[PDB]
Design an enzyme around this catalytic site. Structure first.
Site, mmCIF file in Angstrom:
data_model
loop_
_atom_site.group_PDB
_atom_site.id
_atom_site.type_symbol
_atom_site.label_atom_id
_atom_site.label_comp_id
_atom_site.label_asym_id
_atom_site.label_seq_id
_atom_site.Cartn_x
_atom_site.Cartn_y
_atom_site.Cartn_z
ATOM 1 N N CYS A 169 0.843 -1.189 0.000
ATOM 2 C CA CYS A 169 0.000 0.000 0.000
ATOM 3 C C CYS A 169 0.882 1.244 0.000
ATOM 4 O O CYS A 169 1.683 1.443 0.917
ATOM 5 C CB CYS A 169 -0.936 -0.010 1.208
ATOM 6 N N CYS B 39 0.938 3.681 2.981
ATOM 7 C CA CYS B 39 1.564 3.163 4.192
ATOM 8 C C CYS B 39 3.026 3.579 4.311
ATOM 9 O O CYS B 39 3.547 3.635 5.428
ATOM 10 C CB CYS B 39 1.444 1.640 4.243
#
EC number: 1.8.-.-
Lengths: 114, 374, 42, 49
Positions: A37, A40
């Site tokens: 991700c 993140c």
């Protein structure tokens, strides 16, 4: 002799459960993330800075959704990044946040609600 | 009513927050996030062109030359103002944004339980993002807007789901088209049958639907198409092309799609990232061939928000080119504009930061495609 | 020998040889009285 | 045939009633005086002269 480069610990679901069931004195911040991700990456750097600011006044941990997918779903994680702010007082309910919130916003939750 | 026609985006305004979360089998180092960019250029298939919050589509639509208004609720705190100031800076209309002075933006109160030896959470108080009421709807926006856009994240909130169907009623009463951009959140990936029941009512109300390849296969049969991709002839290939062992770009037949088709559906788009855009209409179907290049900029590539740029590019052309619904050649040419927008969006870190302008998208389209395909 | 030894049961492709090559779908492809019946006579 | 797609390069491996299986092959044009490196049916790996 060499200081470690990262302060935020990665915990299993079983380890996190014992930490929550056990007795705590400082606020507990739980980060759900995944290495695939993109956001993140930005969240990981903010939480490392938050760990430096709150040396022993808070406990910052992280959980990978690739390893604890079922655990994340039961915790009502609807997406990434997701943060849980768990108070040391067992009566108070936890606060779940979504998205790349500012660092100052995290401090206000910890100081005023944790 | 000024031109271009207004579009309305309904849901929660969030910063980043990728909703589509599944399990990937190739994790990087848990601490060294400098390695994580290698998953941006070899992504999981569900993350090739990730979608996001509806505010991403509204921002991307405006940068592509359109006009958009966001309908939703934020808290009266400082983070709520930052989100509104973000959309006002991007020239997104915020008259449809309501303030809840008694709530904290993007903060959900939950209680932790220890049922059957496992840790679970239950919602005590929903955030202001998921608490817009029907009486708080801006009917001037719903009257002017020609496309009403929403995601399936609103189906995870009891309050928003009731509010959503009142917004759809008003939009249809005023002649607006309903755009359902699925973008299934983490809970809705648990089981096919529960998800199909949850989305069926909103699926039937939609005139335009965009789904990813992974979402479409999950909704019909995930194992059948996985077995289909892994089949290899034992002795010889059925044709010369099957010998090259190329990537699978299977185009679903309209009979396979039939369980999901209804009367009011005008256009179904299935996106294989930016590589393929399968389109389905009542009269015809086909695929638009696209491409991607994130390896051209390995240190700034970020696929987050590229799904929103593709959707925004579709809505930009649908409002200004109404003949896309009935002309196949026109539809394919206009969809190549959406492909180009998705490609550019993957070249920058951050969804909002990297959304492309109309002239940049038009330039890339003419550079990538031969002049006869413009 | 086996007795000198110093897991417990109680607890595609077609070979072309003449040198070996493998033939498969990666290099082969397709381009597209009573009534008498075939069978044994005895 | 006029009504048929063009064939691909290779050798006819299988003959059936209404189809043919081809083993893929690539021809190389060589002029007089050129030298072939290898006997007949000699295995050549990718990149070999």
């Amino acid at each position: 002799f060499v200081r470690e480069d990262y302060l935020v610990r990665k915990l299993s679901a079983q380890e996190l459960q014992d930490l929550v069931k056990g007795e705590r004195k400082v606020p507990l911040i739980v980060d759900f993330y995944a290495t695939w991700c993109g956001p993140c990456i930005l969240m990981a750097q903010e939480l490392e800075m938050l760990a430096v600011e709150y040396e022993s006044n808070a406990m910052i941990v992280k959980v990978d959704t690739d390893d604890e997918y079922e655990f994340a779903r039961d915790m009502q994680v609807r997406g990434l990044p997701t943060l849980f702010f768990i108070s040391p007082d067992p009566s108070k309910d936890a606060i779940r946040t979504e998205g790349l919130i500012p660092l100052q916003m995290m401090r206000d939750i910890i100081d005023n609600d944790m | 009513y000024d031109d271009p026609p207004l579009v309305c985006c309904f849901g929660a305004v969030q910063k980043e927050f990728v909703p589509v979360v599944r399990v990937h089998d190739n994790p990087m180092h848990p601490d060294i996030y400098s390695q994580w960019k290698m998953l941006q250029w070899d992504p999981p298939e569900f993350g090739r062109a990730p979608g996001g919050p509806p505010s991403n589509v509204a921002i991307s639509h405006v940068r592509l030359g359109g006009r958009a208004a966001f309908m939703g609720k934020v808290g009266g705190d400082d983070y709520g103002e930052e989100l509104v100031l973000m959309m006002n800076k991007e020239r997104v209309q915020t008259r449809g944004v309501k303030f809840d002075e008694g709530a904290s933006t993007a903060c959900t109160r939950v209680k932790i339980k220890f049922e059957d030896g496992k840790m679970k959470a239950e919602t005590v108080k929903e955030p202001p993002e998921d608490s817009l009421l029907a009486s708080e709807l801006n009917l001037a926006v719903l009257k002017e807007a020609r496309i009403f856009h929403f995601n399936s994240e609103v189906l995870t909130s009891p309050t928003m789901e009731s509010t959503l169907f009142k917004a759809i009623q008003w939009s249809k009463k005023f002649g607006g088209l309903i755009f359902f951009d699925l973008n299934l959140p983490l809970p809705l990936w648990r089981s096919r049958n529960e998800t199909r029941k949850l989305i069926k009512k909103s699926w039937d109300e939609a005139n335009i639907i965009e789904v990813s390849q992974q979402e479409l296969e999950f909704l019909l049969d995930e194992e059948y198409y996985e077995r289909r991709r892994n089949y290899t002839p034992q002795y010889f290939a059925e044709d010369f092309e099957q010998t090259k062992n190329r990537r699978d770009y299977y185009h679903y037949t309209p009979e396979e799609i039939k369980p999901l088709w209804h009367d009011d559906l005008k256009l179904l788009v299935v996106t294989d990232g930016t590589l393929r855009l399968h389109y389905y209409t009542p009269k015809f179907d086909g695929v638009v061939v696209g491409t991607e290049d994130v390896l051209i900029t390995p240190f700034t590539c970020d696929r987050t928000g590229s799904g929103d740029a593709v959707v925004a590019g579709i809505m930009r052309k649908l409002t200004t080119c109404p003949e896309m619904f009935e002309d196949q050649d026109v539809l394919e040419r206009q969809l190549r504009f959406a492909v180009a927008a998705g490609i550019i969006s993957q070249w920058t870190i951050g969804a909002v930061r990297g959304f492309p302008t109309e002239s940049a998208t038009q330039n890339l389209k003419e550079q990538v495609y031969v002049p006869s395909m413009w | 020998r086996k007795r000198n030894n110093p897991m417990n049961p109680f607890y595609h492709g077609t070979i072309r040889m003449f040198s070996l090559l493998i033939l498969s779908s990666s290099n082969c492809f397709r381009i597209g009285t009573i009534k008498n019946s075939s069978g044994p006579l005895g | 045939a006029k009504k048929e797609p063009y064939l691909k390069s290779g050798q006819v491996l299988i003959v059936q009633r209404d189809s043919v299986v081809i083993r893929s092959a690539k021809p190389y044009l060589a002029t007089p005086g050129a030298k072939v490196h290898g006997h007949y049916r000699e295995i050549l790996y990718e990149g070999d002269t």
